[PDB]
């Protein structure tokens, strides 16, 4: 939508869509037309958020997309 959070006995992740949208492009996660995704810790781990997440800010182990 424009902000949504996939909520997790983690520590439940607020991930940017429209600041992610107007930021980087579409492209960034929805190639053609989109609908959903449902990034799930395995994908948001690993080629979803993570991928484009493997270089920036400071690294911390966690705390960079959880709010935990
Ligand atoms: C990655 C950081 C994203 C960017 C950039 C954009 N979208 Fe996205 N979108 C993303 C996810 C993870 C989801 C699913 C949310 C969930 O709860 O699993 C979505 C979903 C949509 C949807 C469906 C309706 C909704 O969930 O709000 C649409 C229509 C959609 N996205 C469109 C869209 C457009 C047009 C964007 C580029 C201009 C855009 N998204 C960027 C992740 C990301
Ligand atoms: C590469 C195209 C990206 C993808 C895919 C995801 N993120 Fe991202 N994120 C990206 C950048 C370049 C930035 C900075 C935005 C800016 O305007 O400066 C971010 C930032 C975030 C943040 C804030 C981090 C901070 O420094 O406070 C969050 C909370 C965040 N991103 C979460 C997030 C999640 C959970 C994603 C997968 C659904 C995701 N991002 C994908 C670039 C990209
Ligand atoms: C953004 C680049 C992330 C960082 C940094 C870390 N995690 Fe994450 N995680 C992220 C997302 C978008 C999601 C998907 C939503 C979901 O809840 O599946 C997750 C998910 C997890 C989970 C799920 C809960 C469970 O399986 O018990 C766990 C365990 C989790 N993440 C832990 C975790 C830890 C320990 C981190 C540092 C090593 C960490 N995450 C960083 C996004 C991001």
Redesign the pocket.
Same mark, same amino acid.
């Given at each position: 939508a424009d902000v949504v959070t996939?909520?997790?006995?983690?520590?439940n992740?607020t991930?940017d869509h429209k600041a992610h949208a107007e930021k980087l492009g579409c492209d960034a996660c929805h190639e053609g037309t989109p609908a959903k995704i449902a990034?799930?810790?395995?994908?948001?781990?690993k080629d979803? &958020?993570?991928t @484009? /997440?493997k270089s920036n800010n400071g690294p911390t182990? &966690?705390?960079? @997309? /959880?709010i935990k």
């Open positions: 996939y909520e997790n006995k983690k520590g992740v991930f990034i799930d810790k395995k994908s948001a781990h979803a &958020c993570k @484009c /997440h182990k &966690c705390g960079g @997309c /959880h």
